[PDB]
């Protein structure tokens, strides 16, 4: 039992590949090293501390959502800056990736179908004693928030914008200043509030 | 590194263990680390506002998900691994095993490996 | 607790002691595993171990700035200062 | 991202921009390369046009004018219609306009104000450098005169000041940038270079003017050896001035880091105080290159070496 | 449980590491706790041994069981040897409202023992109508619970909660009011039966072990010569019955090397092993008889493929320390000797007591691994025999089927790399007179031995 | 009879390849030389004194430990800085190596299996009359030590950290200072001690 | 190079050979080298604390190992070669031969080649 799930986040879509990746899946691993050759001793291998960006490539076909819409969806995702979550069940792969190249093809027969040839890249985020910041931050929320009964603007700021002290960024928006009263502390249920960015 | 200890919390009883003097039972570095690991596993992510995004897991949210059995196994492995590995004391977590005992009721195992579990080369010039 | 300065002699290296021992040999081989090395190296190692541990411990316990335990108690007794002794817990039981 | 020119917006034509500055450079330099089809050819960009580059600042993520200068030279290729500019802020004008001025004893701030007043150069409230300069007669360029008196102000214990233009002339102290950015997080590659190339351990002052001030003030002779210089300036007309000049010259040689960053910190400029690892260094030179991927390269160094070399 | 996410944590020691182990061992253990007069199987779980027989190091049970488990035995067949005079700790608790203080409940330990199990009952501070029923082992709390005052519910609750593997309640009479408050009332009258075990008592354990099957047997850390001779005769008798039991023994603590070698030469059966050196572990000295438990455990765990020729034992120190001449004398005498080599206690040469003859191919019988290999093959052959004796027609087809089964079993042995060559064919000599109830066959195989010594010659 | 054993040391694992290396094993040797051409004489070959880093490459399959766990183990070892010991019995190779590239593949059939294609590099250590320091130093010990009865801290330092005079590195660790008495000379059995790095 | 001699040690008797005068029997450079080679082969590695990591072998540890026959042959070759070659006087050691005489009891040969065994080109301008 092998399936491929692409769980996008910036667009809340969970694409499951209708058809398995044809002939074979393959994944390479290559350690980071570079030769150094010393006089009268010869070559030596020195490990480099980082890790490498490795690719997963395969090819499928989309049988008769329609294949046209699926191809459009994947082409749109190709330009996405945010990462996609790729899960391959039988193969055992699971992690954030991003599509480097995507291509579709129509054949003389089977014109409804679209033969697909897609490639992925491992994704890593740049964050630019205490707990390490190893967790990926891929969670998404709507750009407009409906205030609940128990919410306070600091609570909204922490839930929807991070540090919690980011509330003046929400308040200073003129639409938020209009829907919210002139007192930031007092807020009401139901009214819409727009987080920044 | 200079990690430090904490106080015991018997999760079976849900109460701090206290000596006869009334003070809470202090525990060693590794004991506090294990307590923290269990608490972090039990803490859902993004939902308890006292914590940052780093702390917690998302195992409970996975139950309602529609992904398949093996996909859910991989998701459990990823979630537990990510939740545990934020602690500096963690070296590696793995050797995951699963047993779908009933039709759709699961039991899973894992191993956590400490920084002190590493093996050191013996050499000096 | 003040950090203890140590003389250079008491912190000598084992290899330095072994080299000093082997400096006088010039006819017989002194390679590692050789019989001269067999006779000389354990002496140097024991010398280094004793000189680094026992003598430095003696120096540490010599002065009150770094002494401990019964040694610090005696150094307090030199100027007539005693450490407060413990007591048994007491009370009433019904 | 936005290139205003006089009226238009030629950000829809530029292949890349490179903002480069040196601590002793003539001016903040922007070298923007463009493709020149019929559309761009119509507006007829000439030398002397006013370029304003606007981009999302790193600090507050708001569009701010990071460069405001004038096109100093245009070079057009004909076979490939690639127009290339080399923009300069208006300190390039001061580096080309020669003038002779005679000055009595006074401070650098007063002299800079006098230059701006004479040549009608707008300027913000200039910081009081404090140091009192000896009487001199100058002939070099206005920027040359300003640099000379600022060097003489760094000597005699004054703080290191650098002049940058922006819209109106500013007297920028080196270690006064708002944000001390940390480059270790985006450190693509670094080149820590150490040397005794310009090390100064001793200095034998031989005063050409009286208060017969002569002395030696060797500082680390035992460690690095008596790497001696001779300072024979007429401007040193005092024993305390000689001592402060000597103290403003000692250093452990060249000690710089050729830093390469994978992310362009937009607001970095020459003289700014920036951190790599735990240590802090002053930007000797910065070279941004706003291609399709923003990128930055930096050359930073310690205060002592910078004072010895550039002052 | 409710649907949702649940999680727990355990030490790495508590992993089910029992998977992959081999071999079966037997022991007539002296135990302070557990079932009396019967054999019990443990799957190499220290917690299981602790629950079944306690954790008293003074008693041979926990001590020798821990050593056996450290030897990686798949299954340990423990028998609680007892002297008699057996009693369980018991106590009777009485009613308050009756001025005569009627006895209403009798408590009793789950198994016979002599441990200081106690009971403490106090008024429940929240509600006087209830009371707290706390049960102790010495000063240590062992179980607590609060129960309704009626007698039947009290007995049921004491027999109900999870932590009552130690004590069982029983009703003597019914009453309306709660038991009387008491503190640390010992369950007196019990007895572990370990006091002054008789020589004859081991025979009961042997007879009970006869019905079961096991690869080897080792004594309970006792070097009595009469017991050793009785066990020798018993193992010989079981060999006559087709049960090939391997015996491990150890000489007495005061016996010198001369006495050990004399004992080893006196009985030189290949099924007997003599331990010639005492050892230390956890700062506790172990007599040769006690060490024989660990030696037997290791030999049984190694099974067929492995051997203990140079196995690094768990022990930390040995006594006596033998020179090479003494080592040669002991090994020639059939004595198994542990030796200290660079901080590691290592068994030497895998030998058994059979060293007197070695007149042929009988040389190979002097080593424990070869004897275990032969005995395991004999046991497997007997297991295949009992499926067909008087139950398959004794024609050519049936004999061919049996031969094919034996050949395929030896081919499975070949797949393990144990054997270099084997042959199994018809025993034509005995087949000339065989009948329906039994068939006869012959075989021989070349076992692959573990590498033992290296000889180097440097041409310079 | 051909077998392949990978004896890792930093992780005390001895991996034996379940399946032989398919079609063929091969190993090249090339001497270090570079041409120099002199006027009116022509080309000449000059030996270079050092030795070359040569590779051993092959491809196997892991039949139904599980192949997934074996692949994960080898991928983890690929990032290992410490060397692996490769022993090939019939071929006759034996020496320290390190994995440059590793790759696994699932095929349309035989989905449980994983086709492997692995490559190795000869490993050489960089060190800073008397005996030559030719021996590789690949021995590993646990990062926490249980003190035995006869041990002394100098003996622990020599056995577990090299020179023997490295004992203050063990003592100066605050955990070691706490478990050990304030006298470094006096030490007890059973207490745990942590060698540095 | 300037290697030097040592005193004989009859490994058969385990005692130093001494002249009638009572002094130990001095021996030549090559004799001391052979004595050192035998002693180093007999000395286990990492276990005798008087020596560094360079000195000694690990042949004894290989006996308990689970590697196959040919793997053990290669291990023996590697161990003997590494142990011997640390000496500067050694040029090459090889030509290993093995004979599993009994089922699992082995005899092995090897050749050690000295620096003086090298062959020198004869030429001068």
TrEMBL record, chains A, F:
InterPro entries in the record, alphabetically?
Bact_Kbp, LysM, LysM_dom_sf
Give the species: Clostridium phage phiMMP02
Q: How is this protein named in the record?
A: Peptidoglycan-binding LysM protein
Query: Gene3D superfamilies of this UniProt entry?
Result: LysM domain
- Identify the domain of life: Viruses
Using the record's annotation, list all stretches that form the LysM domain.
Answer: 143-194
Give the lineage: Viruses, Duplodnaviria, Heunggongvirae, Uroviricota, Caudoviricetes
Automatic annotation (TrEMBL), chains B, G:
Q: Which domain of life is it from?
A: Viruses
Q: Under which name does UniProt file this protein?
A: XkdS-related protein
Q: Which residues of the full protein are shown?
A: 24 to 148 of 152
TrEMBL record, chain C:
Taxonomic superkingdom: Viruses
Q: Which family does it belong to?
A: Belongs to the Mu gp47/PBSX XkdT family.
Q: What is this protein called?
A: Baseplate J family protein
TrEMBL record, chain E:
The record's section on InterPro entries has:
Beta_sandwich_Seath, Phage_sheath_subtilisin, Tail_sheath_C
Q: Name one GO biological process term.
A: symbiont genome ejection through host cell envelope, contractile tail mechanism
What the entry lists under Gene3D superfamilies is as follows: 3.30.1370.220, 3.30.1490.450, 3.30.360.90, 3.40.50.11790
| TM ranges | none
Annotated keywords:
Viral contractile tail ejection system, Viral genome ejection through host cell envelope, Viral penetration into host cytoplasm, Viral tail protein, Viral tail sheath protein, Virion, Virus entry into host cell
Give all residue intervals belonging to the Phage tail sheath protein-like beta-sandwich domain. Answer: 83-192
Instruction: Give the source's domain of life in one word.
Output: Viruses
**One Pfam match:** Phage_sheath_domII
**Where does the Tail sheath protein subtilisin-like domain start and stop, copy by copy?**
197-353
Q: Does the keyword Plastid apply?
A: no
One Gene Ontology CC term in the entry? virus tail, sheath
Q: Which residues form the Tail sheath protein C-terminal domain?
A: 360-460
Family that this chain belongs to: Belongs to the myoviridae tail sheath protein family.
Q: What is this protein called?
A: Tail sheath
Q: Which organism is it from?
A: Clostridium phage phiMMP02
Taxonomic classification: Viruses, Duplodnaviria, Heunggongvirae, Uroviricota, Caudoviricetes
């Amino acid at each position: 039992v092998i399936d491929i799930y692409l769980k996008n986040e910036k667009e809340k879509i969970d694409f499951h590949f209708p058809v398995n990746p044809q002939d074979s899946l393959s994944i390479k691993k290559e350690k980071r090293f570079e030769t150094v050759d010393i006089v009268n001793l010869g070559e030596f291998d020195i490990k480099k501390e980082g890790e490498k960006i490795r690719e997963i490539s395969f090819k499928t076909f989309l049988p008769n959502k329609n294949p046209i819409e699926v191809v459009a969806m994947l082409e749109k995702w190709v330009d996405q800056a945010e990462p996609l979550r790729l899960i391959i069940t039988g193969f055992g792969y699971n992690g954030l990736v991003t599509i480097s190249s995507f291509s579709n093809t129509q054949t003389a027969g089977r014109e409804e179908d679209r033969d697909i040839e897609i490639t992925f890249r491992t994704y890593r985020e740049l964050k630019i004693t205490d707990l390490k910041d190893n967790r990926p931050n891929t969670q998404t929320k709507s750009k407009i928030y409906t205030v609940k009964a128990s919410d306070t603007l600091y609570k909204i700021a922490k839930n929807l914008l991070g540090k919690g002290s980011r509330w003046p960024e929400i308040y200073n928006i003129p639409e938020n200043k209009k829907v919210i009263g002139k007192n930031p502390n007092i807020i009401k249920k139901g009214k819409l509030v727009i987080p920044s960015k | 590194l200079d990690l430090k200890g904490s106080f015991l919390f018997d999760f079976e009883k849900g109460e701090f263990v206290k000596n006869a003097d009334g003070t809470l039972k202090k525990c060693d570095k590794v004991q506090a680390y294990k307590q923290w690991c269990q608490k972090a596993i039990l803490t859902p992510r993004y939902k308890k506002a006292a914590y940052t995004n780093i702390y917690g897991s998302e195992i409970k949210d996975l139950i309602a998900s529609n992904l398949s059995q093996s996909a859910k196994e991989l998701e459990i492995t990823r979630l537990i691994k990510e939740t545990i590995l934020v602690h500096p004391y963690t070296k590696e977590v793995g050797e995951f095993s699963f047993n779908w005992l009933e039709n759709s009721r699961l039991v899973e195992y894992e191993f956590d490996v400490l920084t002190i579990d590493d093996e050191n080369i013996v050499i000096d010039g | 607790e003040r950090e203890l300065p140590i003389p250079v002699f008491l912190t000598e290296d084992e290899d330095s002691v072994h080299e000093r021992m082997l400096s006088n040999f010039q006819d017989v081989s002194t390679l590692e595993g050789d019989f001269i090395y067999d006779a000389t190296r354990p002496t140097a190692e024991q010398i280094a171990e004793l000189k680094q541990l026992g003598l430095q411990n003696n120096l540490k316990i010599a002065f009150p700035q770094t002494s401990y335990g019964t040694y610090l108690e005696w150094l307090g007794e030199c100027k007539g200062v005693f450490k407060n002794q413990p007591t048994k817990a007491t009370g009433v039981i019904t | 991202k936005i290139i205003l020119n006089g009226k238009y917006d030629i950000a829809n034509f530029n292949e890349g921009i490179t903002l480069s500055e040196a601590i002793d450079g003539v001016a903040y330099k922007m070298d923007v390369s463009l493709v020149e089809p019929k559309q761009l050819k119509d507006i007829n960009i000439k030398k002397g046009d006013k370029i304003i580059l606007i981009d999302i600042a790193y600090e507050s993520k708001k569009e701010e004018t990071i460069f405001d200068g004038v096109v100093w030279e245009t070079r057009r290729s004909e076979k490939s219609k690639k127009l290339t500019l080399s923009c300069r802020e208006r300190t390039v004008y001061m580096e080309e306009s020669e003038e002779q001025y005679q000055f009595k004893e006074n401070t650098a701030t007063q002299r800079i104000e006098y230059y701006c007043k004479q040549w009608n150069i707008p300027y913000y409230n200039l910081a009081n450098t404090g140091k009192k300069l000896a009487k001199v007669i100058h002939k070099t360029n206005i920027l040359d005169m300003i640099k000379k008196d600022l060097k003489e102000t760094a000597t005699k214990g004054g703080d290191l000041f650098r002049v940058r233009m922006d819209n109106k002339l500013k007297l920028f102290k080196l270690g006064t940038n708002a944000n001390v950015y940390k480059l270790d997080s985006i450190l693509e590659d670094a080149n820590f270079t150490s040397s005794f190339n310009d090390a100064v351990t001793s200095v034998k002052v031989l005063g050409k003017s009286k208060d017969p001030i002569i002395g030696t003030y060797k500082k680390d002779a035992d460690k690095f050896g008596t790497l001696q210089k001779i300072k024979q300036d007429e401007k040193i007309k005092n024993a305390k001035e000689a001592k402060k000049a000597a103290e403003a010259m000692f250093n452990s040689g060249e000690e710089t880091i050729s830093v390469d960053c994978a992310v362009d910190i937009n607001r970095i400029r020459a003289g700014d105080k920036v951190s790599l690892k735990s240590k802090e260094y002053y930007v000797i030179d910065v070279t941004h290159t706003l291609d399709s991927r923003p990128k930055m390269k930096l050359n930073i160094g310690s205060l002592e070496y910078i004072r010895r070399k550039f002052y | 449980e409710i649907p949702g996410f649940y999680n727990r944590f355990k030490a790495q020691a508590e992993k089910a590491a029992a998977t992959g182990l081999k071999g079966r061992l037997a022991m007539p253990i002296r135990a302070n706790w557990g079932d009396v007069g019967k054999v019990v199987t443990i799957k190499n779980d220290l917690r299981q041994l602790k629950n079944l027989f306690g954790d008293d190091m003074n008693y041979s049970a926990f001590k020798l069981g821990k050593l056996a488990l450290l030897g990686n035995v798949k299954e340990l067949l423990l028998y609680r040897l007892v002297d008699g005079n057996q009693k369980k700790g018991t106590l009777t608790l009485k009613d308050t409202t009756e001025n005569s203080a009627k006895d209403v409940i009798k408590l009793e330990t789950k198994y016979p023992t002599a441990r200081n199990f106690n009971v403490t009952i106090k008024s429940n501070l929240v509600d006087s109508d209830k009371k707290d029923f706390i049960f102790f082992e010495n000063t240590k709390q062992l179980f607590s619970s609060s129960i309704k005052g009626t007698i039947d519910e009290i007995v049921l609750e004491i027999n109900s909660n999870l932590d009552n593997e130690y004590v069982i309640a029983t009703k003597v009479a019914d009453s309306d009011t709660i038991l009387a408050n008491v503190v640390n009332q010992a369950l007196e009258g019990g007895n572990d039966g370990c006091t002054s075990i008789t020589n004859e008592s081991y025979l009961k354990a042997l007879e009970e072990f006869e019905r079961y099957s096991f690869d080897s047997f080792v004594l309970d850390g006792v070097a009595d010569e009469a017991l050793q001779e009785t066990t020798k005769a018993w193992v010989a008798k079981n060999k006559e019955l087709g049960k090939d039991i391997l015996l491990f023994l150890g000489g007495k603590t005061e016996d010198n090397i001369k006495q050990i070698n004399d004992k080893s030469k006196s009985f030189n059966d290949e099924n007997i092993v003599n331990v010639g050196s005492s050892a230390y572990y956890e700062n506790i000295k172990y007599t040769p008889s006690e060490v024989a438990v660990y030696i037997a455990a290791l030999s049984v765990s190694k099974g067929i493929t492995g051997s203990i020729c140079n196995a690094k034992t768990i022990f930390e120190e040995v006594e006596p320390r033998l020179s090479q001449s003494e080592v040669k004398e002991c090994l020639k005498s059939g004595t198994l000797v542990l030796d200290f080599d660079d901080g590691d206690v290592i068994i030497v040469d895998d030998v058994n007591t059979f060293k007197k003859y070695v007149d042929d191919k009988n040389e190979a019988m002097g080593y424990i691994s070869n004897i275990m290999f032969i005995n395991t093959i004999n046991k497997d052959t007997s297991l295949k025999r009992k499926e067909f004796v008087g139950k398959i027609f004794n024609d050519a087809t049936g004999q061919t089927t049996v031969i094919c089964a034996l050949k395929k079993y030896f081919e499975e042995l070949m797949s393990q790399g144990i054997i270099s060559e084997f042959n199994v064919d018809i025993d034509t000599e005995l087949q000339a007179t065989a009948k329906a109830d039994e068939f006869y066959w012959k075989w021989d195989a070349v076992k692959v031995d573990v590498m033992k010594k290296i000889y180097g010659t440097g041409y310079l």
